[PDB]
Design an enzyme around this catalytic site. Structure first.
Site, PDB file in Angstrom:
ATOM      1  N   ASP A 290       0.848  -1.184   0.000  1.00 34.48           N
ATOM      2  CA  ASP A 290       0.000   0.000   0.000  1.00 34.48           C
ATOM      3  C   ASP A 290       0.896   1.250   0.000  1.00 34.48           C
ATOM      4  O   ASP A 290       0.675   2.181  -0.762  1.00 34.48           O
ATOM      5  CB  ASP A 290      -0.929  -0.035   1.208  1.00 34.48           C
ATOM      6  CG  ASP A 290      -1.777  -1.296   1.260  1.00 34.48           C
ATOM      7  OD1 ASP A 290      -1.444  -2.222   2.032  1.00 34.48           O
ATOM      8  OD2 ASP A 290      -2.787  -1.438   0.565  1.00 34.48           O
ATOM      9  N   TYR A 374      -9.805  -1.421   1.083  1.00 37.45           N
ATOM     10  CA  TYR A 374      -9.131  -1.321   2.373  1.00 37.45           C
ATOM     11  C   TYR A 374      -9.187   0.069   2.918  1.00 37.45           C
ATOM     12  O   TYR A 374      -9.080   1.028   2.179  1.00 37.45           O
ATOM     13  CB  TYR A 374      -7.638  -1.650   2.293  1.00 37.45           C
TER      14      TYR A 374
END
Ligand SMILES: [Cu+2]
Ligand SMILES: [Cu+2]
Ligand code: NA
Ligand code: NA
EC number: 1.4.3.21
Lengths: 620, 620
Positions: A290, A374
């Protein structure tokens, strides 16, 4: 005047202007990454030189550049063409998210696959997923995204409820070609909706929650000066923000009597990886960095008052670059507040008759980001008693798949036909240590059990041992919860009143590290994640445990390459890299939206102070 | 009308009257323990029978009795004379605390020791310390306390700053004799004061803390009925109090739609032990079972508003017996409140355009107790999402000694000449499980790593395994943090909508267990503390992991004796006993009063619900 101030809109615009003037930012150029650099070591004596690092992508297929600009002097310091096949592709651009679906929509292989499943192409969302490095030779040197499909029945529908399993596509996002479409066979697309605001699923909303009001009638106990310098209950620090790392803390120090004592020079989450554990070929390549691939800072949410952050909140609104070098503000992107934290210390003494109670508090610095399904919250806490803590809060919607008829060893069932592949969320905290200054060392401390015998006749004794990590080759360490293993960072040249080196003890949660086979692509690309603790000698170009360019980048950079230098770390400028994460076997309770789960670490003073530092906290 | 209501002052007075009428409570009798018993299994059908268990001591040297009384019927159910040499001495009486110092004050050996150190007897406090079981044959069958001395310079002085090392005495508190005085040589008595309210040590008190106001303008969201029945955000339970265990939670259940679903029948801290790891003969016998030997509930503090407990607090004021059977109220001894707990769930979805945030809360039930230098807070939390958590908060003043010239492997230095022996604080939580009713089983769940090869060509797969604990002989389990070990309690006869047994997962902190040599007295007396998890078949007389009488009681009772029965625990009425604790190497920061440190555990739903149970929580 602080050289650690947040980037201003003016500085970003000026970097844009400098790049333009230098011929580096023509119409086919896009900024993939832009961030301010920290001042070099010992640069407090000299005048300010604000420098910015830029990764520039070219949409016409030309090679990207890494550029350093002095916004202060209006100059290009350095500019180098990158060979991405060697050093890595630039981070995924936000403008590329839409491209995967767009290209696939007119591809005859994709359309054939959707037709086999009786799915309307207009309703099929495609997730733009990082590709990693596997067996496909044609991808080396190319910017590839992989696409997994989810059906969205109507505009407000949660597509995650409807994964299209057995199907994956690979796309070259620069040349705008679909390189491969793999269809391993139809799976039923799960039919139940996951719309957590639909009254049919929620049922009647509770009316039982009475309000909780948190106010500070005299305002907060912390001050903010210079835009981002915090002073709170003896602590001092600067709150930075970077588009890759998110919130970065600088110059964490504690005022002990007259003297401002450094503790940590820089604290950040320098990487985070989400490896998936489903061996299906549809997903066996899935690993999302990420931070390194997507740049979590850039997707920081605007945080609503009394909702995301409760109480008397002071916000920072960091400024980042868009793809063309124009400043864009993330309004209310960082929350800062103090909160009560229960009892700090208490004793009711029979002999003296004195009853004593004091309350604890912590300063909280946080942000929340979203990437796809997410959502992550990143929280830093400073406590009255000197403790420093980090906590990650994981929520959002679980990444889904079909649930195979007759079950799975690698996937959980969430709803009829709906699966959730097993995965981990693993973080790397980079702690550029400065315990009473830069001359630091790390010791591994284990509990030591003792045998009943001479000197221990009742078999009650226990002890501990400390092993100094003297060189980087011996500073790659694993957890041992059973023996109470921790790591102490101390300053061998700074002693407390009892003549012991001052220190801070790192307490880990001892969660499992990276589970993948050691021979996997992900074990090499996320090598940091295979061990709990690394210690390196500080170097200004050793910023991330995965190196500068993670996207489609093999092993070769990052922590394993840094420690090969085998540098002295015994009383030197050192950096601790702590791996910690969650291992997630999704539960039915995680669906259709996940309740927060947490992981973190903390550091507590270990003979840093000459006695408790909270004796001067007042009653009530 | 609840059979789980708190004991009333009237019930205790009535037990007193019943005992008196029966000839069991004459003038030489003292109540060492008195508590209400829980209703027997399946007794909800029958009318109430409130029964009380009493341990009666006799100050004239006669044998003590264990008595069960029916306060409802006004009868003695059973009364048995105890042979303490066999089954154990009764808990330490509060009235005995003063006796050790009092007796020693006119003992010529004690006075000689104090004279050698130039200490005024009038200023020497003596801690009344449990004796345990060692090599002294004359102590078997006798109520012994051991005494360690601390100098108190003036009435408000903290005597803990001034330990008198090298000296210990043993006292028979019934016959009122000093059995032994051991003087191994003089150590300097540390001179620095530890008076944490003295301005000379605190310095000027901070003026920087601005107020934090936590209010609930409509009152709290929980209701209290029947004195101690709580209803809060789908949870229902009864808050009991016992003089040995402290706060006990009964009938923890969650209202899922229409149906009240049991989760835990009874939750308590059934023991807690503080073993010391200093092999000096002055302290090598020190192990304090706060719960079993001293009865922690009885020393629960009265908790001041806006100070010990902050916000909108509802208090319970439990009633206990004094030594003569008269009721005594612990005013404001239990705090109950709800508090905000950050973000519950959050997702900002690109595809649907829906941004969603919900706040978490927890119900808090707590108390705080003091025994000597130690102060402990016991906190139970119920969360919106179904999580149950326990947390212990340890504070007070560290138990001190001299710090030996030239150091120690078993003692920390806190101040010049002042030592703190290493020790642990280890708890046993007894969880009488009732996951959707009483037919439960426990599985140990480990993460399973997988090898790269056929079926796992990219080496990314990982899995887990569950092993059912089928009989008590195989249900003594240790932690394995490296493999993410947890334990699931499920009901094999109650399935969720996905046809999987409903369950709850116990997440431990994986702290070290009892460190003492396995052949030590403490390893036998605190056998429970050597392993992380035990599972027994429920029996109404298996209440404590150390048995009923812990004081001066050898091995022979408690958990090792319970599990020898090797009963079926696979789909039966079962009890989980979780050992968890802190290992304390005291730091300079713990002196002169200790900042709180914590340890605990939690249980999270694991396919108990059919989807997230918090979809009906409203916005803002
Ligand atoms: Cu997850
Ligand atoms: Cu302790
Ligand atoms: Na450093
Ligand atoms: Na049970």
């Amino acid at each position: 005047a602080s050289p650690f101030r947040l980037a201003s809109a003016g500085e970003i615009s000026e970097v844009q202007g400098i790049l333009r003037t230098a011929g580096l930012l023509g119409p086919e150029k896009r900024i993939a990454y832009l961030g301010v650099l920290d001042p070099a070591r010992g640069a407090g004596s000299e005048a300010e030189d604000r420098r910015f690092r830029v990764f520039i992508h070219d949409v016409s297929g030309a090679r990207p550049q890494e550029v350093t600009v002095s916004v202060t002097n209006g100059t290009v310091i350095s500019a180098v063409e990158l060979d991405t096949a060697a050093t890595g592709e630039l981070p995924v651009l936000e403008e590329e998210f839409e491209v995967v679906e767009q290209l696939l929509a007119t591809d005859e292989r994709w359309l054939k696959a959707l037709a086999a499943r009786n799915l309307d192409v207009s309703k099929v969302r495609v997730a733009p997923l990082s590709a990693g490095v596997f067996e496909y030779a044609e991808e080396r040197g190319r910017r590839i995204l992989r696409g997994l499909a989810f059906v969205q029945d109507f505009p407000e529908d949660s597509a995650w409820a409807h994964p299209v399993d057995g199907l994956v596509a690979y796309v070259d996002v620069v040349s705008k070609e679909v390189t491969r479409v793999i269809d391993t066979g139809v799976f039923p697309v799960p039919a139940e909706h996951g719309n957590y605001t639909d009254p049919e699923l929620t049922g009647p909303l509770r009316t039982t929650q009475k309000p909780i009001s948190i106010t500070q009638p005299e305002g907060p106990s912390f001050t903010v000066t210079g835009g981002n310098h915090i002073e709170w209950e003896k602590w001092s620090l600067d709150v930075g923000f970077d588009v890759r790392e998110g919130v970065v803390l600088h110059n964490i120090a504690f005022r002990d009597g007259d003297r401002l004592r450094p503790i940590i020079n820089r604290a950040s989450i320098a990487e985070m990886v989400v490896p998936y554990g489903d061996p299906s070929p549809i997903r066996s390549w899935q690993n999302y960095f990420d931070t390194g691939e997507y740049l979590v800072g850039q997707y920081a949410n605007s945080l609503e008052l009394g909702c995301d952050c409760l109480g008397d909140i002071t916000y920072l609104s960091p400024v980042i670059s868009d793809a063309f070098g124009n400043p864009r503000e993330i309004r209310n992107g960082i929350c800062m507040h103090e909160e009560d934290w229960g009892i700090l210390a208490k004793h009711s003494d029979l002999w003296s008759g004195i009853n004593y109670t004091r309350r604890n508090r912590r300063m909280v610095i946080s942000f929340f980001t979203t990437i796809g399904n997410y959502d992550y919250g990143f929280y830093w806490y400073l406590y009255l008693d000197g403790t420093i803590e980090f906590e990650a809060k994981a929520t959002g919607v679980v990444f889904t798949s079909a649930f195979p008829e007759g079950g799975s060893d690698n996937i959980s069932q969430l709803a009829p036909g709906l699966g959730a592949p097993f995965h981990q969320h693993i973080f790397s905290a980079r702690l550029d240590m400065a315990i009473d200054g830069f001359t630091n060392r790390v010791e591994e401390e284990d509990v030591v059990r003792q045998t009943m015998g001479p000197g221990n006749e009742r078999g009650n004794a226990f002890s501990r041992k400390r092993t100094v990590l003297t060189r980087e080759s011996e500073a790659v360490r694993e957890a041992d919860a059973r023996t109470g293993r921790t790591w102490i960072i101390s300053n061998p040249e700074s002693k407390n009143r009892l003549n012991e080196p001052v220190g801070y003890k790192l307490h880990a949660h001892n969660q499992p590290t990276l589970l993948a086979d050691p021979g996997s692509s992900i074990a090499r690309r996320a090598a940091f994640a295979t061990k709990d603790l690394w210690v390196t000698r500080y170097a200004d170009d050793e910023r991330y445990p995965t190196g500068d360019f993670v996207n489609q980048h093999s092993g070769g950079a990052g922590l394993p390459s840094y420690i090969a230098q085998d540098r002295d770390i015994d009383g030197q400028d050192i950096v601790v890299w702590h791996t910690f994460g969650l291992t997630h076997f999704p539960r039915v309770e995680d669906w259709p939206i996940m309740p927060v789960d947490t992981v973190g670490f903390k550091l507590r003073p270990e003979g840093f102070f000459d006695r408790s530092p909270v004796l001067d906290v007042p009653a009530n």
